[PDB]
From a paper:
To reveal the assembly mode of this complex, we further determined the cryo-EM structure of DUF4297–HerA complex at an overall resolution of 2.87 Å with C2 symmetry imposed. The high quality of the cryo-EM density map allowed us to build the CTD of DUF4297, whereas only a partial part of the N-terminal DUF4297 domain was modeled due to the weak density of this region. The cryo-EM structure reveals that twelve DUF4297 molecules and six HerA molecules form a giant assembly with a molecular weight of ~1 MDa. The architecture of the resolved complex has a shape that resembles a human head in a hat, with a 172 Å × 172 Å × 180 Å dimension. The HerA forming a planar hexameric ring resembles the head, while twelve DUF4297 molecules, organized into the upper and the lower layers, resemble the hat. HerA forms a planar hexameric structure with a central pore in the DUF4297–HerA complex, which is significantly different from the nonplanar conformation of HerA alone. The base of the hexamer, supposed to be the DNA entry site, is closed by the insertion subdomain. The HAS domains and two layers of DUF4297 adopt a nearly C6 symmetric conformation with a continuous channel. Six DUF4297 molecules from the upper layer are held together primarily through mixed salt-bridge and hydrogen-bond interactions mediated by the adjacent CTD domains. Six DUF4297 molecules from the lower layer do not contact each other but form a tail-to-tail dimer with one neighboring DUF4297 from the upper layer through a loop connecting helices α3 and α4. The loops connecting helix α1 and β-strand β1, and helix α2 and β-strand β2 of CTD of the lower layer DUF4297 form extensive polar interactions with the HAS domain from HerA.
Author numbering:
A (entry chain D): 5 to 115
B (entry chain B): 5 to 571
C (entry chain E): 458 to 568
D (entry chain E): 5 to 229
E (entry chain J): 151 to 394
Amino acid sequence: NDINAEVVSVSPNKLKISVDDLEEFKIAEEKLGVGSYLRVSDNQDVALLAIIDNFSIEVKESQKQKYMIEASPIGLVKNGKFYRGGDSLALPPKKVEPAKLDEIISIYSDS
Amino acid sequence: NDINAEVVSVSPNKLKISVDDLEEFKIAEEKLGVGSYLRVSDNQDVALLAIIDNFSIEVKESQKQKYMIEASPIGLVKNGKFYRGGDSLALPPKKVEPAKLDEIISIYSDSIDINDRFTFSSLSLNTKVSVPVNGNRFFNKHIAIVGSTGSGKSHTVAKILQKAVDEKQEGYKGLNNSHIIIFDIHSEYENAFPNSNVLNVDTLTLPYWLLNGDELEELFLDTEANDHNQRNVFRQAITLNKKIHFQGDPATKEIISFHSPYYFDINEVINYINNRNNERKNKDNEHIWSDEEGNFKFDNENAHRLFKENVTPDGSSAGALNGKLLNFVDRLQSKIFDKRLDFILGEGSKSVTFKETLETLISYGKDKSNITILDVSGVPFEVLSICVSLISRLIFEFGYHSKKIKRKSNENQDIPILIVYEEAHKYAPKSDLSKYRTSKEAIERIAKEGRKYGVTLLLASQRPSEISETIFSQCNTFISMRLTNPDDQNYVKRLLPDTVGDITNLLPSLKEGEALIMGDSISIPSIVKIEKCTIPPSSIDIKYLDEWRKEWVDSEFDKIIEQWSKS
Amino acid sequence: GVTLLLASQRPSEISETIFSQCNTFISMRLTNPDDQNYVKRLLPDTVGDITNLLPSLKEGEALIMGDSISIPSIVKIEKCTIPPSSIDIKYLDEWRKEWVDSEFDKIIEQW
Amino acid sequence: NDINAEVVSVSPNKLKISVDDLEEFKIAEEKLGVGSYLRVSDNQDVALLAIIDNFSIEVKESQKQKYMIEASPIGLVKNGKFYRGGDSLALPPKKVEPAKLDEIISIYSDSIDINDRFTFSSLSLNTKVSVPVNGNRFFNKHIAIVGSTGSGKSHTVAKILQKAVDEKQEGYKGLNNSHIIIFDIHSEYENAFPNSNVLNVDTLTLPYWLLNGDELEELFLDTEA
Amino acid sequence: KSFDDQKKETIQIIKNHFQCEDYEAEHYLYSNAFRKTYDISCNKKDRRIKKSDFVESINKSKVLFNIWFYQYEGRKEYLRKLKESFIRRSVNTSPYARFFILEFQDKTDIKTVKDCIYKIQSNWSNLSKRTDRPYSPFLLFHGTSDANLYELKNQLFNEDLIFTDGYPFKGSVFTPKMLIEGFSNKEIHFQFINDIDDFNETLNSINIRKEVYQFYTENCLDIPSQLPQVNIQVKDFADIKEIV
C-alpha cells in the first residue's frame, strides 16, 4: 500500500480524508494536491469520486503526522461509467486512493 | 432494529438527532438524505415530522461512530392527518426513524383536496410520493420557474403547461379552458406542443397603432435627442390621425387621446411631420399651405390636410419648426421601411383590426388552441421589449374588460390567462434603463394587479439576478431547478417565501430533473422530481462543429448576396 | 374630526407626506421588498426581527404599532363572521371547464 | 412539581432560566415556547415578567436534562398591576413559573383605561389574550393597514369597522354615532357590511358644480391639445 | 331519516342528557345505547322496553362492542374510531404507570398475543439511555390457564424482551417493589402482572399518575374506579393491536 488514506468524516458535500502512511512520497505531490481526484470506495467496482479542496499536514514532535484532506464528492463511478450529481452517502470509514487515469477520463469523456 | 436514532438536542427551529445503531445501511443512503423526512415520537400515533438539514458522520479509531443528524421540525402528524407548524415541542430524548410512506403522503395529500390537486411531479427522495400543489392557487398566484442552463428548466415549464392543457374534467372531448401564452425567444416550445399556434415574425402581425403613448415614443423617439418639439409633434400627428380614421360612433371621436388604441396611418404621420419641417410663416406667425383645393392656414380645422405629401407651403420667413424635425423624419423612415419591423410596421398592420389581433394572441381565431407560443426569436432586440409590452398590456387589459363585464353581469364563464415569460430578465430587468422600461412596467402591472383580472404570469429564467425584486417577489409560487451561480442563489434566498431551515442550500447540488417548489400552493417547501417530458422542448441549435467539419460550401454564397439586394 | 384609514395592497406607492401622517400602523404580510423598505423606514417603532417576519406573517397576522398600542406586538386579527367579497379566480376550476366560446366577443365589443 | 425553573444568570436585558424537573410535559409545549411569557419572583404578588427569546433542551446519557431558557424582562407585576420597563433587577436565584392568563392580559390592557379599550385582535402566540389598543388614540390619528395579496388586509379593515359599529354605549338600541366612509374600488365591502349604504355609479349623484376649477378642467378639458 | 342517514341526530340527545363531551357521546355512550337496544330486540321473548334501568345500564364505564357499527364501515374504519377517542396520544407521552389488562383466552395463539405485546411495549415505553425518567407499560392477562400463561411468558423472554412479575426467583412471594423498580429501569422492557391479586397489590405501591387500558372480549375486570380506565370490547385479540 503506497497510499493509505481513509475517510474520517462525511458531510452532505464534504469529506475528511486522513492519510495514514504515505509511503511513496510522490503521490502527495501530484495526486493529493488541491484539485486532484480521489477514489472513495471499499471495493474496486463502485466508487465515489471526490475532488480535493483543501489539505493540512500537521506534524508534531512526539505524535504522528496527521495528514488531513478535505474533499467534496462530484459523482459516482459504477464499473467504468461515471454518473454525475455526487450526493450518495459513503458511510465512513472508506479506503481512499488517487483516481487512476481511466476514471478521470470518464469524468470528462462519456458525458 | 434497522435504525436507532434519537433526539439529543432541541432548538426553537432545529433538532439534533444522534443515530446510535445503523444496521441495514440503506436507510442512510435513501432515507437519511438532506431532503429526507423523519418522524420524532415515542409512539406510532402522533409524531413530530421533521426535515433533515445537516449531518456529520465522524468516525474514530477507538471511539464509537457518531452520526449527529441536524433536522428542523416542519409540522405535526396525528392520526394520519398532518398539521404544519414549527412551534411544536418534542422533549428529548425521542425515538427517531425515517417517516413512513403514509406520513409523507399525508404531508401533501391532506392539505389540498381532490378537486384542487394538480400533480406534475413526485418527491425526489421518495418516488412513490406524488407532490400535488393547490392547482387553483398554483396559477392564480404568479409562478417563478428558475434554474441554470442545462438543468432542464424548460423541461419543467412545458410539463406544467402540458398537465394544465390535459386538465380536462369528465364530460367532453374538446379542448379545455386553458389559456397559456409563451414568449419563446429560444424557440424551444414549437416541438414541445405540436397542437398549438406558434407565431414568429413571418406569421405574427402586431399593429403599431395598438401601442400606447409610452411604447409609441419608445419605438420612434431618440432618448439622447430628447427634443420637446419632436416629442410633442408626435402626439399631435398621431392623435389627430386617430380621429380621422375613426368612422363609427362620433361620440368617442373627440375623446381620443395619444394613449387611446385606434388606427392611424403612420405613412401620413411621417408626411405630417415632414410637412412641419417645411413650415413657412407670414407676418402674423401663421403657417400657410397650398394644395389642390386651395390655400389654407395651419389650424385644427386644416390640420388634417397635411397628412398627404401633396402640400406646397407658402410663406416668407422661417417657421417655428423649419428643419428641427428632419432628425425625426429620417429616424421615422428608418423604422417603417425596416424589413425586420415588417410585422409591426408593414402593410399587414394596416389591414388587421383589434379583434383579429386579440384572436391571434390567445388563439381564439379559426384554429383554437390552449397554448399560443409567441416565437420572438426573430424580433429585433431593440424592439423586443416593446413587442412584449404590447402583448402584455393587451392581454392584461383584455382580462380587465373580461372581469368588469362579468362584474355587472354575474356570470361564471371566465377566461383565465397564463403568460409564460421565458428569459424574463430580458423583459423585466433589475436595471432602471429606459429601453426596457416599457416591458418592465407592463409585466409589473400583470405581477401586481393582474391576478384579480385573470391575467397571471410565469417568469422563467436561467439567470434570475436581473429579475427585478418588485416583480419576482409578486410570484408567490416559486420553482427552482439547479442554480449554480451564488449571485443567483443569494438573490433567490433573500427573495424567498417562508421556507424551512436548510432546503434552499440544495440549489447547487440539484441533479437532472430535480426542482424545488414553495409558496401558498404547496403544503411544504420540498425537493421533488419533475415528471419527465414525453415531448420535450428542443430548440433547433445550429451545430457549428457539425457544419464546420463539412467541406467548404461554395454554392451557398451568391444565393445569400443576391437575396440581400432583393433579387 | 375627519381622519383617514389608508388600506393599500402596495404601501410603497403611497406618498411619504401622506403615509407618515398616520400614527397607528397595521402591517400584515409584505412580500415585496420595496414595500418592506418603505414600511420599515416610515414605521414609528421597531420589533426584533421585522426584516424577516414581514414576509413571514401568516394569514390574518398583523403588527399593531403606534400611539394607540404601547407594545408593538404580533397579533391575530379576529375572524370575520361576515367576510368581504374576496377577489380570486380558481384557475384549475375554470381551466377544467371546456373551451369558453360565448364570452369572448362580448369583451371585444365593449373595449 | 409541574415546573421547577429558576434564573441562573441576569444580564441588563437578558435572563437565563434553567428548568430542573418539568414533571408535567404539557407545560413545556405551550407555556415554555419562544414568545411565551414567564413570571420571575420569589413571592406571589411582586414579580418580573419575561418573554422567552430562545431555549435549548440538552439531554445526555449520564447527566440530567439541561433545559435552559433565554428570556428578556419586559416589565413588572406589583399586586396584579403591570408596569412596563425591563430595568428592574432580580438577583438570582428567582423561581420561574409560566405567567397566568390574567398576567399576560395585564401586559396589553393595563396601559389602557377600561373605558378606552378597543379590541379587534388577540395575540398571535396566545389567542386567549386579547390585544387592545388605546381606543381614543386609534381613530383620531390616521391608520395605515398594509398587507400583501390574500393576507387578509381587506379582512382586517372590515373587522375593525365592524367592531366600530358594534361599539355602543349600554344605554340604547339602534345606530351609534360611528361614521365610516369607504372608497371601494374592488367592490368587496358590500358583502362585509350588509346594513350599509353601498353607492355605485347607478345610485350615486355627485353634483358637478361642487368641483373646483382644477377638477372642472379634467372632467371636461383635454390637456394635450 | 334512514338507517344510514338519521343516526347523527341521537348524539345531541345523549350530549345534553349527561352534560358530556363529544368524544364519549358518539363513541362510548351512544354505541353502548344502541347495543342494549339490540339486546331487547334480538331476543324473541321480551320486546317490551323499560326506561328506569335502561338509563344507568349504558354508563357502565365500558365501551361494548357493536356488531353493526363494525359492519357497514369495515374493520379499518371501526378500529381507528377507537384510536382517536380513548387512546389519545401525544408526542410527549409522560411517564405514567400504564396498565394493560388483556383478555387472553385458550383459543388465542401465542404469536398474536406476542404481536400485541410488542406493539404495547414499543408505543408505551421510552427506555432510552439518555432519559432521566424512563417508563414501561404494565401487562396483565386473564382468562387463561396458568400453563398456557407461562408459555407466553417463556417465549417472550427468549426474543430478548426482559420483564418482571415481582417473582425474581423460584418460590418467591409477590414483590411489588420489583415492578416499581422496573418502571424506572431502562433494561426492563415491561412488567408482566401475573394475576388480579398481584394487580391490586401493585396500585398501592405507586404514587405517580396511573392509567388503565383494559381490552377484553367477553369478561371485564372490576378495576377500582378512582383511577382513569379505558375498557374496550373487541371481537378477537388481533383487534387490540391496531388500537393500542
